[PDB]
Design a protein around this ligand. Structure first.
Ligand SMILES: Nc1ncnc2c1ncn2[C@@H]1O[C@H](COP(=O)(O)OP(=O)(O)NP(=O)(O)O)[C@@H](O)[C@H]1O
Ligand SMILES: [Mn+2]
Ligand SMILES: [Mn+2]
Lengths: 297, 198, 729
C-alpha cells in the first residue's frame, strides 16, 4: 500500500516510560503509538475500522539531521560488542549492514552518530498531603529532550482513506501529545506527513530475510511457519489501561509479549490487533501488526 | 466534535523566579537539559494554578475536571495540558545584549532567634527581565463546560499573577505576569474569538 | 569406585612437586611422581590403587615401565597432564599477565611471593616455606581430609587454599604462569571428561586406546573428546537494578546475591547430573559459566535435558525476566592445547552458538503460553512490578518478599543453604536461605541432596560445604546503628553533601584479552583457566580488602564488572585506589573504565544504575581507559582525575580555603559562574575575583593559568565542584 513518512518534531521533553515514571525512553513502540491513535480517534468521534483493519505502522524511530535511523537487524554478524551496543542504523547504511561491510569501528561510530536528544530526570513534589498536615512527596519524572534537528519518525501503510484518517489523527495528536506525562507538559509535538522517497526505495527491495519494523506478534497459525530460524527479542508489553470508561479504578492490562523491532524472520507474518483487556467495559487494543522491511543477508 | 484550544503567550517574570531541582550551584533552578536555559515546568504551573483554584473554589469537581483526576469511580482526563514554559528566544537575545546572565544568585541569611547570628544562604533565581513562552492546551470535552472552565482558568491565572510561582515567593520571589499572544482552536469546530484570559 | 579414584588421582597427581621442592624427609632422588606416591602412601585413606598409580605414573617414562593393570586410570591421568601442560627448584609463580597482551604491551617479569599481588621483584621460594607447606598438607590429609564420593569437593577446595600460588611448572625454558592448583584442577577436569568418554565407547583396555603405540596418543588428541559449554543468564541487569520502593536500597544487594547463588546452583545441578565435581567448572562470573564436559552421548543428552529443564523453570518462576542459554561445541585434545591454532576459534564458536541461542530464546509453545494470559494482575509488587505472580500483603511479589527476607540475614550469616525449604525459589524444586553455622548444619542433616555454600571462608574440617568467593563488603554492617539503614546511612554526614556515589567499573577488552591477548604459543586450556581464576579472585575476594574502611557497599564484583554504592567521596577515592590496585594486580596489560554518579538518597535505584551505566559507556569510548565522573562532560583519564583534578587542583584549593575563617563556598560558587562562560570579560572578572579572594598569590596565578587552557579549565571546574560538595552544611 502507500507508505507515508510521519516526522515528529517535539516542542517539549517527552516522558516515555518502560515500567516506571522515572524511566526516560527516547522512543515508543507501535503498540504505544497505535493506542494513542485509538484514543485520539475515539475522542474525535472517528471510526476505528481503518486503524484496526488496514493501518500498518512501525515503531517510532530516531531521526536527526541528514539521517533516518532504522532498528538494528537481529542478524548474525559473519569487536562484536560494537554491534551488541548498537541500536539504530541509518537508512543509507542499512543496506550495507545486512550484507556486512560494517566493522566494529564503523558500528561504534554509527551509535555515537545518533544525535537523538538527551535523557534526564526532573524531580517534583506533591503538596497534596502538605495541606492535610502531612509532608511533600518528592517524585521523579524521567523525560527525554530531543535536539533541535532531531525527533521521531514512523511510516504508515494503508489505503487512501486510512492514510487520510491518520493525517487527521496525527494533526489532533500534535496537541494531545504522546508520552506519559502529557497533561503535565511532557509530550507536545508537531508532525508532518509526507510521501517517503528514500523509504519507498528501501521497502521496494526484496531480499531473502524479512525485518520487523514494528513491535509485532504472530497469531497461533502464523507462529507455526514463521518461527523457524528466526532471530528476535520478546519484549514484555505491560502497563495500565488509560481510559475513563474501562473501569472505576485503573487496572493493568494482560501481559502481552511481542517481538521487538528489527527482529529478522525468514517467513513473513501478518500480526494482529490483540486484545489485552480483562472483562473491562471496552476492549483494550494492543497493536502487534507487522511492518516488514525485507533485506538481503 | 472534540476540540482543543491552544493558549500561547508569555510569562514575564516580575521578580526573580526560583523553581528548584550545569555544575554545582547553591539551590539551582530547573533548566532544560539540552539548552541549559532556565524553564518553568508545566507541572509547576499546573500545580500552582490547581492550588490557587482549589483555595478559590473551597476535591472539587471543577478542579478535578480541569487539572485531571485519578480517584476511584471518577477518573477525569485533564483538560489543561500546560506545557513547559521555555526561555523565549526574544528574552535570550535581549539578555545577550547587556551580557546579562539568564539567572542571578540572590544572597540572604537567617539571623537566629537564640544567638542573633546570620547564617547565609544562596538561591539561584531567574532574572527579572526573563520571559517564558507558555503553551496551554484546553481539551473541550464538554461544549457546555468550556465557558465555566475558562472562567476558572482566568480566575486561577489572576490569582497566580497576584501570587508567586515556584520558590520562596512569600519572601519576594516567583512573581509573574501572564500575557496572552493568541487563543486559537487548533483542533475542532469550537470557536475561541469570544474566549479570553485575563 | 574407579571414577572417584581417578578424580582424586588427577588432582593430587603433581603433589610430588611440592614435596620434592621441600626435600624434607626421605628424598630418594626419584621423579616428582615417585615422591608424590611416597608422600600419599603415608596416609591410609589415600592409599587407593587408582590414586597412587595416577600420582606415580602420569608421565611417559613412568608409564613405559608401568606394569599396570592395563585398565588403570593412570593412562587417563597421563593424557590429562599432556593436554593440561601442553629446571629451577625454588621459582616463584609468574603472574599470568606476564603473557597477557604481550604482543602490544610487551613482556613483564611480575612474580608472586610466598590475595597476593605480583611485585616484579626478583625472588625465590625458600625451601623452608615449601617445608612448611608440606607440614600443613600432612596435617590436613591425616586429620581433616578423607577419601569419599562426597568428600572430593572438599579436597578440590583444599588444593585451592594452598596451591593457588605455587608454580605448577619450574622448567626455566618455558614461562610458568599456571599455578599448581590451576594445572591440577584442569588435569582433573580433563581426566574426568576423558574417563567418561572412554566409558561411553566401552573401551575395556586403556593402554592400546591411549598410550601403547604412542601414535594413538597423538590420535586421541585428534578425537572429539570434550565439550566446551557456556551457560549465560540474561536479564540480570533488568532483574537486579530495575526495582522501586524505599526497600529497594536495602534489598539491592540481596537481588544480586540471589542471582549469584542461582547461577552457582545451576552449575552444581549440571555437574551433579554429569557426576562431575566443580573441577570441570572452568569459570563462573557475571551470569556466565564455562564448563568442560565429556563428548559422550550421555553428556549431550544431559545438556539437552538440562537446557530444556532450566527453560521450563525460569519461565515458571520469572517468565521472560530471567533466562539461561546453553551452547556446547565438541573440541579435541589439540583444540585445548592450541596445537593447530584453533583454541581461540573454539571459544569464539562456543560464544557464537551462545549468541544464536540467545536470539531464538523461546519456542512455539513458550511464546504462545506467554500470550495466553487468563487474568490481568490488577495488583503489582512495589519492587519487581510483577502482576502475574501472586502478591501477598505489603504489596510484594513472592520472589521479592523472599529477597527482602534474605536481607537482614545475608549481612549476619555466611552460609547459603540450598534446601527443600527456603526463602527464594531455586531450580529443581529447591529454595535458597541464608543461615548460620548451626542452622545450616540442621538443614543438611534433615534432608539429603542439600547443598551448603560458604562465603569467603578459609578451608575447614570435613563438611559438604562448597566455597563461594563472593564480595560481601558492606560498611553499614560494621556499626549496629548504621546496620538498620544499609546504604542510606552513607547519606548521613557531619560535613559534606549527603549524595551517594555509584561506581560501575568494567575491564576493557577482556574478551579480546582472552582471544588475542594470550599469544599462540602460550594459549591453552590451563593457561586461560588460570587467567579466569586470577581475574575472578580479584573481584570476588580482593575487592573487599581494597575498599576497607570506606562507606561503600558492594552490590557486585563478579569477574569483569563492578557495582558499588556509598558515600560520593568514598566511592571516588576508592575508585582511584581500586584503579591503582588493579594496575598492580594486572601488572598493566589490562585497563578498566568506570562511571561514577552523584545521586541522593531516594533517587530511583534503576536510574542510579542506568545513568551510571551510561557514564561507563561514555568512558568506554575512545581508548577505553577513562573514568566518567558525574556529568558526561567530565570524562577524564584515570591518572588525570587522580592527579590533575584532585591532588594538583582540588587539594590546593581545600587547604587554602580551610586556612581562612570560612571554608569558601562563596568564592567557589563565584569561581564556577565565571568558569562556565567562554567570554573574554569573564576571564578578567575571574582575575579580579581571585585577587580579592584573599588567598596565596602563587595559587591565584595557578588558578588563572588553569582557566586559560582548555582540557585544563574543565579539570579546574571539577576540582571546584568536588570541593564545593566536600563542604555542604
Ligand atoms: N549477580 C549479579 N549482580 C549484579 N550484576 C551482575 C550479576 N551477574 C552479572 N551481572 C552483570 O550484569 C551482566 C549480565 O546482565 P544481562 O542482563 O545478562 O546482560 P548481558 O551480559 O548483555 N547478557 P544478555 O542479556 O544475554 O545479552 C554481567 O555481564 C555483569 O556485568
Ligand atoms: Mn569487560
Ligand atoms: Mn562487563
Amino acid at each position: 500500500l502507500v507508505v507515508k513518512l510521519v516526522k515528529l518534531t517535539f516542542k517539549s521533553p517527552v516522558h516515555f516510560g518502560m515500567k516506571r515514571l522515572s524511566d526516560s525512553n527516547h522512543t515508543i513502540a507501535a503498540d504505544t503509538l497505535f493506542s494513542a491513535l485509538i484514543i485520539e480517534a475515539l475522542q474525535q468521534q472517528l471510526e476505528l475500522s481503518h486503524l484496526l483493519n488496514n493501518l500498518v505502522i512501525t515503531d517510532l524511530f530516531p531521526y536527526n539531521k541528514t539521517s533516518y535511523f532504522l532498528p538494528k537487524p537481529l542478524i548474525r554478524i559473519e569487536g562484536y560488542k560494537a554491534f551488541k551496543k548498537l541500536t539504530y542504523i541509518p537508512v543509507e547504511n542499512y543496506s550495507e549492514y545486512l550484507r556486512g561491510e560494517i566493522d566494529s569501528l564503523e558500528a561504534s561510530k554509527i551509535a555515537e552518530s545518533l544525535n537523538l536528544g538527551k535523557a534526564s530526570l526532573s524531580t517534583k513534589v506533591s503538596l497534596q498531603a502538605v495541606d492535610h498536615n502531612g509532608e511533600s512527596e518528592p517524585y521523579s519524572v524521567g523525560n527525554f529532550t530531543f535536539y533541535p534537528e532531531s525527533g521521531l519518525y514512523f511510516l504508515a501503510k494503508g489505503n487512501a482513506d486510512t492514510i487520510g484518517q491518520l493525517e487527521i489523527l496525527m494533526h489532533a495528536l500534535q496537541y494531545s501529545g504522546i508520552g506519559g506525562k502529557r497533561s503535565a507538559g511532557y509530550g507536545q509535538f508537531r508532525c508532518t506527513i509526507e510521501d517517503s522517497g528514500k523509504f519507498d526505495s528501501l521497502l521496494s527491495q526484496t531480499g531473502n530475510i524479512a525485518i520487523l519494523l514494528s513491535s509485532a506478534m504472530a497469531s497461533d497459525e502464523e507462529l507455526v511457519d514463521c518461527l523457524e530460524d528466526a532471530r528476535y527479542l520478546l519484549k514484555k508489553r505491560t502497563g495500565f489501561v488509560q481510559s475513563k470508561t474501562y473501569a472505576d479504578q485503573l487496572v493493568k492490562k494482560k501481559d502481552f509479549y511481542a517481538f521487538s523491532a528489527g527482529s529478522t524472520f525468514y517467513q513473513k507474518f501478518n500480526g494482529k490487533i490483540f486484545d489485552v483487556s480483562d472483562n473491562g467495559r471496552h476492549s483494550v487494543y494492543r497493536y502487534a501488526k507487522a511492518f516488514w522491511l525485507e533485506g538481503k543477508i | 466534535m472534540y476540540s482543543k484550544i491552544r493558549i500561547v503567550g508569555k510569562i514575564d517574570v516580575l521578580t526573580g523566579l526560583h523553581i528548584g531541582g550545569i555544575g554545582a550551584i547553591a539551590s539551582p533552578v530547573v533548566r532544560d537539559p539540552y539548552s541549559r536555559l532556565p524553564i518553568i515546568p508545566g507541572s509547576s504551573i499546573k500545580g500552582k494554578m490547581r492550588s490557587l483554584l482549589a483555595k478559590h473554589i473551597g476535591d472539587a469537581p471543577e478542579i478535578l475536571r480541569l487539572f485531571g483526576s485519578s480517584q476511584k469511580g471518577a477518573i477525569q482526563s485533564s483538560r489543561l495540558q500546560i506545557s513547559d514554559a521555555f526561555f523565549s528566544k526574544a528574552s535570550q537575545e535581549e539578555f545577550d545584549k547587556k551580557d546579562l546572565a539568564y539567572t542571578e544568585t540572590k544572597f540572604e541569611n537567617t539571623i537566629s532567634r537564640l544567638t542573633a547570628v546570620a547564617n547565609p544562604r544562596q538561591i539561584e533565581r531567574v532574572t527579572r527581565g526573563a520571559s517564558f513562552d507558555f503553551h496551554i492546551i484546553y481539551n473541550v470535552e464538554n461544549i457546555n463546560e468550556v465557558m465555566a472552565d475558562f472562567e476558572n482558568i482566568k480566575t486561577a491565572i489572576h490569582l497566580l499573577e497576584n501570587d508567586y510561582l515556584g520558590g520562596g515567593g512569600t519572601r519576594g520571589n516567583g512573581r509573574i505576569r501572564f500575557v496572552i499572544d493568541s487563543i486559537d482552536t487548533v483542533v475542532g469546530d469550537f470557536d475561541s474569538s469570544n474566549l479570553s484570559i485575563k | 569406585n574407579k571414577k572417584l579414584e581417578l578424580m582424586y588421582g588427577s588432582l593430587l597427581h603433581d603433589i610430588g612437586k611440592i614435596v620434592y621442592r621441600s626435600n624434607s624427609v626421605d628424598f630418594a632422588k626419584g621423579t616428582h611422581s615417585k615422591i608424590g606416591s611416597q608422600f600419599l602412601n603415608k596416609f591410609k585413606p589415600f592409599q587407593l590403587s587408582g590414586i597412587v598409580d595416577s600420582v606415580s605414573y602420569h608421565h611417559y617414562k613412568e608409564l613405559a615401565s608401568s606394569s599396570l593393570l592395563d585398565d588403570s586410570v593412570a593412562y587417563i591421568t597421563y593424557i590429562a597432564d599432556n593436554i593440561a601442560s601442553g629446571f629451577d627448584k625454588r621459582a616463584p609463580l609468574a603472574s599470568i599477565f606476564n603473557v597477557v597482551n604481550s604482543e602490544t604491551k610487551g613482556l613483564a617479569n611480575y612474580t608472586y611471593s610466598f590475595y597476593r599481588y605480583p611485585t616484579d621483584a626478583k625472588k625465590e621460594y625458600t625451601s623452608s616455606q615449601y617445608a612448611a607447606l608440606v607440614n600443613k598438607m600432612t596435617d590436613d590429609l591425616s586429620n581433616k581430609l578423607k577419601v569419599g564420593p562426597d568428600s572430593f569437593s572438599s579436597l578440590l577446595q583444599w588444593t585451592e587454599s594452598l596451591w593457588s600460588y605455587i608454580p605448577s611448572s619450574t622448567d626455566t625454558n618455558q614461562v610458568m604462569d599456571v599455578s599448581l592448583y590451576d594445572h591440577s584442577k584442569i588435569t582433573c577436569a580433563i581426566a574426568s571428561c576423558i574417563y567418561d568418554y572412554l566409558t561411553e565407547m566401552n573401551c575395556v583396555n586403556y593402554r592400546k586406546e591411549l598410550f601403547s603405540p604412542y601414535e594413538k596418543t597423538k590420535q586421541f588428541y585428534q578425537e572429539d573428546v570434550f565439550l566446551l559449554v557456556s551457560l549465560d543468564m540474561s536479564g540480570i541487569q533488568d532483574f537486579i537494578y530495575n526495582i522501586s520502593g524505599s526497600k529497594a536500597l536495602k534489598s539491592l544487594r540481596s537481588r544480586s546475591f540471589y542471582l549469584e547463588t542461582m547461577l552457582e546452583s545451576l552449575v552444581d545441578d549440571l555437574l551433579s547430573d554429569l557426576e562431575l565435581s566443580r573441577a570441570n567448572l572452568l569459570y563462573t562470573g557475571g551470569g556466565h559459566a564455562y564448563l568442560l564436559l565429556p563428548n559422550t552421548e550421555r553428556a549431550r543428552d544431559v545438556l539437552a535435558s538440562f537446557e530444556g529443564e532450566m527453560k521450563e523453570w525460569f519461565i515458571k518462576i520469572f517468565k521472560t525476566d530471567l533466562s539461561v542459554a546453553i551452547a556446547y561445541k565438541a573440541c579435541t585434545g589439540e583444540d585445548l592445547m592450541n596445537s593447530n591454532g584453533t583454541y581461540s576459534d573454539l571459544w569464539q564458536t562456543v560464544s557464537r552458538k551462545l549468541s544464536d541461542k540467545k536470539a531464538h530464546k523461546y519456542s512455539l509453545n513458550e511464546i504462545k503460553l506467554f500470550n495466553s494470559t487468563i487474568h490481568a494482575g490488577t495488583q503489582e509488587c512495589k519492587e519487581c512490578l510483577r502482576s502475574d505472580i501472586d502478591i501477598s500483603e505489603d504489596s510484594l511479589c513472592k520472589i521479592c518478599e523472599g529477597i527482602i527476607a534474605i536481607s537482614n540475614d545475608l549481612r549476619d550469616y555466611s552460609f547459603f543453604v540450598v534446601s527443600p525449604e527456603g526463602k527464594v525459589p531455586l531450580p529443581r524444586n529447591r529454595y535458597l536461605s541464608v543461615e548460620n553455622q548451626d542452622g545450616a548444619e540442621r538443614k543438611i542433616k534433615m534432608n539429603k541432596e542439600t547443598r551448603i555454600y560458604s562465603k569467603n571462608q578459609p578451608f575447614v574440617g570435613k563438611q559438604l560445604v562448597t566455597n563461594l568467593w563472593m564480595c560481601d563488603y558492606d560498611f553499614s554492617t560494621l556499626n549496629p546503628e548504621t546496620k538498620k539503614q544499609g546504604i542510606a546511612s552513607y547519606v548521613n554526614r557531619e560535613v559534606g553533601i549527603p549524595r551517594l556515589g555509584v561506581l560501575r567499573a568494567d575491564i576493557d577488552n577482556l574478551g579480546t584479552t582472552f582471544i588475542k591477548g594470550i599469544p599462540e604459543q602460550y594459549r591453552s586450556i590451563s593457561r586461560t583457566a588460570t587467567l579466569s581464576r586470577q581475574l575472578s579472585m580479584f573481584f570476588k575476594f580482593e575487592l573487599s580488602n581494597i575498599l576497607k574502611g570506606a562507606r561503600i557497599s558492594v552490590i557486585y564484583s563478579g569477574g569483569d564488572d563492578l557495582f558499588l554504592i556509598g558515600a560520593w567521596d568514598d566511592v571516588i577515592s576508592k575508585a582511584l585506589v581500586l584503579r591503582k590496585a588493579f594496575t598492580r594486580f594486572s601488572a598493566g596489560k589490562l585497563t578498566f573504565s568506570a562511571g561514577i554518579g552523584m545521586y541522593p538518597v531516594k533517587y530511583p535505584i534503576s536510574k542510579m544504575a542506568s545513568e551510571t551505566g551510561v557514564l561507563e559507556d561514555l568512558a568506554k569510548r575512545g581508548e577505553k581507559n577513562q573514568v566518567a565522573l558525574w556529568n558526561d562532560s567530565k570524562v577524564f583519564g584515570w591518572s588525570q582525575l587522580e592527579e590533575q583534578i584532585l591532588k594538583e587542583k582540588m587539594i590546593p584549593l581545600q587547604e587554602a580555603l580551610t586556612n581562612s575563617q570560612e571554608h569558601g563556598k562563596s568564592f567557589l560558587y563565584k569561581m564556577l559562574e565565571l568558569l562556565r562562560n567562554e567570554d573574554q570579560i569573564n576571564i578578567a572578572r575571574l582575575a579580579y575575583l581571585l585577587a580579592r579572594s584573599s588567598l596565596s598569590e602563587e595559587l591565584t596565578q595557578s588558578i588563572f593559568a588553569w582557566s586559560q587552557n582548555k582540557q585544563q579549565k574543565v579539570e579546574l571546574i571539577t576540582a571546584i565542584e568536588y570541593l564545593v560538595y566536600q563542604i555542604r552544611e
